[PDB]
Amino acid sequence: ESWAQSRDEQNLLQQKRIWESPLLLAAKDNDVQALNKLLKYEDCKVHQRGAMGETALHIAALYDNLEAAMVLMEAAPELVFEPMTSELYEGQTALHIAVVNQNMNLVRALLARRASVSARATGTAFRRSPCNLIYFGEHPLSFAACVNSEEIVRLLIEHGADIRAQDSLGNTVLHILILQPNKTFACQMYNLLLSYDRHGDHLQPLDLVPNHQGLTPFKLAGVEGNTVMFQHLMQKRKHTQWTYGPLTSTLYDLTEIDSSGDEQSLLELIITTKKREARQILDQTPVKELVSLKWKRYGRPYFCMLGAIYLLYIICFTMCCIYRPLKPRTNNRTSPRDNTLLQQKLLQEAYMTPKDDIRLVGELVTVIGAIIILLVEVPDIFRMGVTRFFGQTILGGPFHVLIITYAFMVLVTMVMRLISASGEVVPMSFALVLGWCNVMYFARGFQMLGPFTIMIQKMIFGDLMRFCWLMAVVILGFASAFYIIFQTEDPEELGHFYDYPMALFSTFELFLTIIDGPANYNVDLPFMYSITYAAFAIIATLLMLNLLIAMMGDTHWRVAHERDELWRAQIVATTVMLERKLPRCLWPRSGICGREYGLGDRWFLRVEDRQD
Amino acid sequence: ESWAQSRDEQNLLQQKRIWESPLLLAAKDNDVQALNKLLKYEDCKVHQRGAMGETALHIAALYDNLEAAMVLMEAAPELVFEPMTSELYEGQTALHIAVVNQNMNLVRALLARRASVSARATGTAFRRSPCNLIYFGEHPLSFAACVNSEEIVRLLIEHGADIRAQDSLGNTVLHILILQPNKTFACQMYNLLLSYDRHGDHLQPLDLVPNHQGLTPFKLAGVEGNTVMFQHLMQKRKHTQWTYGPLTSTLYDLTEIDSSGDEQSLLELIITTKKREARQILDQTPVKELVSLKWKRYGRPYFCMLGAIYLLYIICFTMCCIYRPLKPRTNNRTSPRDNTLLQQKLLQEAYMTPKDDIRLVGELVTVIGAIIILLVEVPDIFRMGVTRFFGQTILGGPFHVLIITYAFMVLVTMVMRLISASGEVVPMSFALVLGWCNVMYFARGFQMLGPFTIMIQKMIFGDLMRFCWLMAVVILGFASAFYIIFQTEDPEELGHFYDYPMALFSTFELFLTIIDGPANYNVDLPFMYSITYAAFAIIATLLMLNLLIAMMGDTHWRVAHERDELWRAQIVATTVMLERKLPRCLWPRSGICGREYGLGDRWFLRVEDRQD
Ligand SMILES: CCCCCCCC/C=C/CCCCCCCC(=O)O[C@@H](COC(=O)CCCCCCCCCCCCCCC)COP(=O)([O-])OCC[N+](C)(C)C
Ligand SMILES: CCCCCCCC/C=C/CCCCCCCC(=O)O[C@@H](COC(=O)CCCCCCCCCCCCCCC)COP(=O)([O-])OCC[N+](C)(C)C
Ligand SMILES: CCCCCCCC/C=C/CCCCCCCC(=O)O[C@@H](COC(=O)CCCCCCCCCCCCCCC)COP(=O)([O-])OCC[N+](C)(C)C
Ligand SMILES: CCCCCCCC/C=C\CCCCCCCC(=O)O[C@@H](COC(=O)CCCCCCCCCCCCCCC)COP(=O)([O-])OCC[N+](C)(C)C
Ligand SMILES: CCCCCCCC/C=C\CCCCCCCC(=O)O[C@@H](COC(=O)CCCCCCCCCCCCCCC)COP(=O)([O-])OCC[N+](C)(C)C
Ligand SMILES: CCCCCCCC/C=C\CCCCCCCC(=O)O[C@@H](COC(=O)CCCCCCCCCCCCCCC)COP(=O)([O-])OCC[N+](C)(C)C
Ligand SMILES: CCCCCCCC/C=C\CCCCCCCC(=O)O[C@@H](COC(=O)CCCCCCCCCCCCCCC)COP(=O)([O-])OCC[N+](C)(C)C
Ligand SMILES: CC(C)CCC[C@@H](C)[C@H]1CC[C@@H]2[C@H]3CC=C4C[C@H](OC(=O)CCC(=O)O)CC[C@]4(C)[C@@H]3CC[C@@]21C
Ligand SMILES: CC(C)CCC[C@@H](C)[C@H]1CC[C@@H]2[C@H]3CC=C4C[C@H](OC(=O)CCC(=O)O)CC[C@]4(C)[C@@H]3CC[C@@]21C
Ligand SMILES: CC(C)CCC[C@@H](C)[C@H]1CC[C@@H]2[C@H]3CC=C4C[C@H](OC(=O)CCC(=O)O)CC[C@]4(C)[C@@H]3CC[C@@]21C
Ligand SMILES: CC(C)CCC[C@@H](C)[C@H]1CC[C@@H]2[C@H]3CC=C4C[C@H](OC(=O)CCC(=O)O)CC[C@]4(C)[C@@H]3CC[C@@]21C
Ligand SMILES: CC(C)CCC[C@@H](C)[C@H]1CC[C@@H]2[C@H]3CC=C4C[C@H](OC(=O)CCC(=O)O)CC[C@]4(C)[C@@H]3CC[C@@]21C
Ligand SMILES: CC(C)CCC[C@@H](C)[C@H]1CC[C@@H]2[C@H]3CC=C4C[C@H](OC(=O)CCC(=O)O)CC[C@]4(C)[C@@H]3CC[C@@]21C
Ligand SMILES: O=c1c(-c2ccc(O)cc2)coc2cc(O)cc(O)c12
Ligand SMILES: O=c1c(-c2ccc(O)cc2)coc2cc(O)cc(O)c12
Ligand SMILES: [Zn+2]
């Protein structure tokens, strides 16, 4: 916005000041004879500051003018130690520019005059940001690795580059290559930089050194969805046991992958990333066999056991609403439109028989069970929802909004029972619907979990809610029309639209065709009704048929074209929740440990397969 | 047509008159034995103007006969200066014919005898028309460039042919190459014709010469959807500022692209054309970030401000119709089928209480708001086209008609209130439905409802005008059957078909299954009722299933795959509309004026990308 306008004016007044200054211009235009005349005129203003604090060496390096960049050196050798001074390109020297532009003959002549290989481009354009378009690090050795130039990397380290150097984000030169868009070229540069880590006394192998978020180069490849570097780093963690003809028993490490409770694991960090490429890591041969192992053995059976206890809680709540205390009414019927026969009992007369004491036991099971919902989930939606992730699990999305809304409605029914307020049917009727609609979500884990089952259910609900916005204006147009047509008529003969909230609810029902069209045949209806309702019935039929076709066309686009899994991240983030809630004695750790088989303290997973 | 019938007659009349004359036949069949004999007989009629006014030299050129064409030229050299004189081929010389046929040895012999390279073939088979298979221009350079003849366009320019000659449409040779089906050969011939503009002292260059519609070759590539010539002509408008490794900062021109405020810009021409491949130019590089810049900063805020003001205007109109002046009726009910209790107040009765004065404000808001609709949208719907430019504003413009018909219905209700006419429910009922269905227009300005409203609104008028004719045939056949069956019965029990306009409305409702099938069970219905209604129920089931299968084929399959491109084409069409009507004080001009940066008085767009 205001900042994007600021970058654009900054680049235009850069080119404006390179044209209105001759030594900046000849460095750009590679006018080698124009340098000799101006520099012999008593070295005029060789300490230039252009738009981005640039000197004339920065211009000559930027446009790959090797012949013009030489003349600046013998004229004043103090320009090779000069950075750019603006906020956007802060700290960038000429050695950074020639490395990114891959100018071989220039970068030797810079090192020939002792250019610092440990400079730090701290500017706002050299920071990881979606507004920035490249993130190449902060060091010249980091710039050489990202543009894929093997010969510069061998040249820079020879002059003393530090491969252990880190950024302001803590990323070393091996963290940055995982962030690069071309994966295959970054895979060759990874093997190169590890070969120069001879260094057996640095107390840490360099591909274990964490950034300021604690992530290793292994975990960062799992978070950023870099599947090419993930499979490359996994051969460091395999161990082939035997090969019996076509069979092979491979043993995987599972130290930085499986959860230990005290530390965030790779399975959790894929979920909170919310990226589309990070879910491809869940398809990989150590991780894919781990998720299906614990969602077959502990994760799924405990999911169905918690849903069976919730079903007994809602049945116990349902019985207390059916047998709610009611007495015949005390006052007389006011209007002839008053249908009410019964009313609620007061608190003193609610409990005076032994059959009410059986109900009182059931009413206390409900309230105690409603507090437990608040005591375990008011932490959860703070932890889960706004901090890490929301709506990408099974039992997920509008489950946690609704079951919190359930337990709120039960405690409202308790208050209205105590102060003997009228209208407890209103918090109960919400709580029956809210409570039983949550049972449909536990029914989602009774499935074999295909790749396009839960996301299609989530999709169809998403299109129906978009259809309800477009049909609200169609109802409001025709309900207002139907209201003023029958506004001069007698509602004893046709009372579908007798006041305006009823006319709105009738037109909603006629749209879905769940009540019949109004007709009497013993009296003359207005003529404007018949042509309006014939227009309404054609519109409502076509809009309901186009809804079905639009759900078919949107189903095809997300199965055949969007090509996103969604089905492994749902069973991961469900299994993470049940593992933090249950104690350790009910949850054995997946894999098998060492010290009785002699491999360490590490929890290995054996995978046996057939090559064919 | 008898036009195309008359064309085929003279194509056979041409072949007859050649086959009659021995001179014309020997030119055709390349019988040079007969050529020397017919000249030594007599200097005969070598100006035999046949059916389509041609000579023997034209026939030697049409059938590619080198030896026959030469003998005509030495015997009578005055035939090279002869055009065809009919209506279908007016002005075409023999030089036009040999150039299209690419008989390049004949081109040397014709240019030796100073054949006119500036003759204009102004025939009806040379104008641009959808009934002609060719549109190659009117000039021999225009004919040579479109058949991809590099050797003849080099030959004709050397012999004094004008490159900047125009048709009777203003099209130069550069315009016509854009109108050719082979885009690849059009680009190579385009570069060759600019290389012969070395003698530029003329006020406009060739690529900056408009036709009679004012379009340049760059704009005509935009209108016709020629994306191949569009990207190649955009290289002349670019200006690369710097290159930093994989980064590139390009600076686009935006002179013939952006809305200049006076002349119809390229964004306006692509929206208001009846084509489909022009909509791919909306995804080209300078155009895509231009309209994204306008929509994020000024398009979407202004569209949602107008959307919220319109919604409050319709709620104010709705409450003035709910509280419309009604009083109890004066006279008594005539028949026992009279249901009416109330009627309209008179004008002197309608405003007596202060509750009416609150309605009097909201009725003035409604009337004033309806005049503004007829002053923003009427003085551009006649001054920018009354017929078929009007119709272009209706094809992709179905909410222009709805909001103008709304504004007339509000003003009809005003006049009937002033003259105290009875029947205001008839203009109001149209105005309530047309008022609330225009809210669906503003659904395009949202990501969540954007592509989904495309799928819901799209319906085919080929298979739905088929259904609505086949629905009306079933209704007329079965309501007439249902009428005469119950014509001898008592309508007190079953009154669904008591007179013939009601039987049409009941069978319409039974076809859509929105009222129940008539039944009593306390009385004996006729036997023909059960036979007919069972046949009617199967036919109505059949035609509903025809409508579903028709809505699943070859158009909804395309809209499901193109819903995002169609939604962005609505964003561009809205942004163009809002930029014209809003003043320049609320809409700043897009780009950056390069006046204070030494670039001329132009507005530039700076685009930065990564080339990888
Ligand atoms: C009847 C009308 C009144 C209701 C209006 C309000 C209702 C909401 C309407 C809102 C406006 C209409 C737009 C559609 C809904 C959002 C768009 C969407 O993405 O759809 C999503 C629906 O949502 C889910 O099923 C997943 C859960 C995430 C969202 C949380 C819902 C809020 C809970 C409160 C709910 C109400 C309970 C409140 C009362 C207690 C799914 O779309 P998808 O992308 O195809 O799915 C792929 C999953 N993926 C995204 C992970 C890849
Ligand atoms: C999430 C997907 C769905 C979308 C949600 C919204 C869906 C719609 C939900 C609607 C919920 C209810 C809204 C209106 C309720 C008022 C009724 C009332 O009190 O009537 C009173 C009158 O007063 C009125 O009639 C005021 C209503 C007129 C304007 C309608 C409100 C516009 C909705 C805003 C949003 C729309 C925009 C949404 C689309 C952009 C009493 O009238 P009466 O008893 O008949 O007696 C009158 C006296 N007389 C006899 C002299 C005549
Ligand atoms: C592209 C899709 C759109 C198609 C449009 C179709 C929509 C239909 C448009 C309908 C127009 C609006 C409705 C009014 C029509 C009723 C006329 C009337 O007033 O009846 C009066 C006279 O009764 C008659 O004699 C009428 C007989 C048929 C004439 C009218 C339909 C034309 C038939 C051909 C159709 C042409 C169409 C060609 C094929 C489609 C009074 O009725 P009654 O009191 O019962 O009098 C009976 C007296 N009796 C008791 C002695 C017996
Ligand atoms: C696994 C799931 C799969 C599905 C299987 C489901 C399992 C089986 C499902 C249901 C069991 C079988 C049907 C029950 C019928 C009850 C007997 C009856 O007919 O009514 C009789 C009495 O009954 C009562 O009055 C009940 C009063 C409220 C009881 C609340 C539950 C207490 C449970 C305690 C804790 C539970 C622990 C739960 C938490 C862990 C007759 O009553 P009445 O004379 O007609 O009316 C007057 C009563 N009034 C005076 C109060 C108004
Ligand atoms: C004691 C507490 C329980 C503890 C149990 C401990 C062990 C539990 C362990 C495992 C339990 C489950 C193992 C069953 C075998 C799996 C088959 C399956 O999932 O069906 C199908 C899903 O269809 C469904 O949605 C459910 C089908 C079953 C009906 C309802 C189950 C019980 C509901 C309540 C009744 C009372 C039960 C609760 C009592 C209150 C499979 O679908 P699909 O074939 O893959 O379709 C793919 C098609 N596609 C590829 C095109 C997309
Ligand atoms: C997303 C947004 C949603 C929320 C939006 C709000 C939605 C809901 C809003 C309000 C709810 C509805 C009202 C509540 C019910 C009380 C009724 C009442 O007492 O009113 C009384 C007066 O009222 C009228 O006469 C009608 C009002 C005139 C239309 C609006 C005028 C305001 C103009 C300003 C325009 C501002 C700018 C406009 C735009 C540029 C009716 O009393 P009565 O006794 O029945 O009258 C009968 C008298 N008679 C018999 C002689 C006829
Ligand atoms: C009557 C009362 C109505 C309600 C009150 C109105 C509100 C106040 C009144 C007027 C002010 C209107 C908004 C002006 C300022 C906001 C503009 C803006 O900056 O864009 C913002 C959003 O913008 C929106 O989402 C607009 C939502 C407001 C409601 C639109 C009203 C029209 C609805 C009626 C017709 C339609 C329904 C049709 C139904 C068939 C930015 O866009 P973004 O997507 O957030 O960016 C991505 C976010 N990210 C960068 C972090 C990733
Ligand atoms: C004034 C009226 C409209 C009441 C407003 C409440 C409803 C808008 C919401 C509240 C929670 C309900 C939900 C409760 C649970 C269901 C199951 C559903 O998830 C499923 O298991 C079915 C699979 C699928 O989503 O397609 C998602 C929402 C739904 C239909 C409901 C949608 C609508 C309901 C009635
Ligand atoms: C599903 C598509 C076709 C429409 C989606 C719109 C719904 C989200 C809304 C708007 C229309 C409905 C409303 C229609 C009118 C009624 C009036 C109702 O108040 C009364 O019934 C009073 C009746 C009386 O006074 O006689 C409150 C909300 C309700 C059920 C509805 C609440 C929600 C509904 C389902
Ligand atoms: C009181 C009663 C008699 C009012 C009757 C309402 C009709 C006069 C209007 C109001 C809303 C409708 C319109 C709303 C929008 C559509 C778009 C449609 O197709 C298009 O123009 C392009 C497709 C698209 O919408 O994107 C043509 C007319 C149609 C069905 C409608 C034509 C007529 C309808 C039924
Ligand atoms: C006196 C008794 C009958 C009280 C009711 C039983 C409760 C002790 C249990 C069983 C049903 C409840 C559960 C209902 C559902 C949730 C989700 C949870 O599953 C997940 O964490 C995954 C959610 C997701 O992946 O989106 C399992 C337990 C929890 C919080 C609840 C924990 C405790 C509750 C209140
Ligand atoms: C007393 C005052 C405050 C009442 C408010 C008046 C507005 C409700 C109306 C008057 C005329 C305007 C409208 C004039 C025309 C346009 C375009 C739009 O219809 C189209 O022409 C686009 C249709 C298409 O391109 O397909 C509908 C509403 C809009 C933005 C305007 C919406 C709001 C406006 C300001
Ligand atoms: C292309 C679209 C418009 C659909 C094509 C079908 C409609 C043109 C026709 C088919 C039969 C219907 C008609 C059938 C009979 C009725 C009689 C009605 O006259 C009356 O007086 C009502 C009956 C009575 O009160 O006696 C006015 C027209 C109506 C609703 C209908 C008008 C339009 C309908 C939907
Ligand atoms: O059930 C249907 C049918 C349907 C299904 C089977 C038939 O034999 C006929 C219609 C058509 O459109 C719908 C459209 C809808 O929006 C919802 C539906 O349930 C249906
Ligand atoms: O035509 C469809 C569609 C379909 C897809 C996208 C659309 O826009 C419309 C229909 C989906 O599933 C089918 C499934 C079928 O067995 C047969 C079909 O013809 C279809
Ligand atoms: Zn497809």
GROMACS .gro file of C-alpha atoms and ligand atoms in nm, chain A residues 402 437 440-441 444 457 461, ligand 8:
model
   42
  402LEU     CA    1  -2.103  -2.609   1.946
  437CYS     CA    2  -2.558  -3.264   1.649
  440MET     CA    3  -2.248  -3.672   1.415
  441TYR     CA    4  -1.888  -3.562   1.459
  444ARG     CA    5  -1.677  -3.931   1.153
  457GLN     CA    6  -1.840  -3.331   0.382
  461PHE     CA    7  -2.165  -2.762   0.412
 1232LIG     C1    8  -3.250  -1.972   1.288
 1232LIG     C2    9  -3.198  -2.111   1.248
 1232LIG     C3   10  -3.139  -2.111   1.107
 1232LIG     C4   11  -3.099  -2.171   1.354
 1232LIG     C5   12  -2.950  -2.132   1.331
 1232LIG     C6   13  -2.849  -2.248   1.370
 1232LIG     C7   14  -2.786  -2.323   1.244
 1232LIG     C8   15  -2.740  -2.216   1.142
 1232LIG     C9   16  -2.674  -2.414   1.272
 1232LIG    C10   17  -2.635  -2.425   1.420
 1232LIG    C11   18  -2.544  -2.573   1.429
 1232LIG    C12   19  -2.612  -2.675   1.319
 1232LIG    C13   20  -2.539  -2.749   1.272
 1232LIG    C14   21  -2.529  -2.841   1.344
 1232LIG    C15   22  -2.459  -2.969   1.291
 1232LIG    C16   23  -2.481  -2.997   1.152
 1232LIG    C17   24  -2.369  -3.133   1.080
 1232LIG    C18   25  -2.267  -3.094   0.981
 1232LIG     O1   26  -2.150  -3.187   0.987
 1232LIG    C19   27  -2.180  -3.326   0.954
 1232LIG     O2   28  -2.148  -3.412   1.028
 1232LIG    C20   29  -2.252  -3.364   0.821
 1232LIG    C21   30  -2.154  -3.370   0.701
 1232LIG    C22   31  -2.147  -3.237   0.626
 1232LIG     O3   32  -2.104  -3.134   0.683
 1232LIG     O4   33  -2.184  -3.231   0.506
 1232LIG    C23   34  -2.227  -2.954   0.989
 1232LIG    C24   35  -2.334  -2.844   1.036
 1232LIG    C25   36  -2.498  -2.902   1.079
 1232LIG    C26   37  -2.584  -2.938   0.956
 1232LIG    C27   38  -2.570  -2.784   1.134
 1232LIG    C28   39  -2.587  -2.666   1.044
 1232LIG    C29   40  -2.685  -2.578   1.098
 1232LIG    C30   41  -2.707  -2.574   1.227
 1232LIG    C31   42  -2.857  -2.603   1.259
   0.00000   0.00000   0.00000
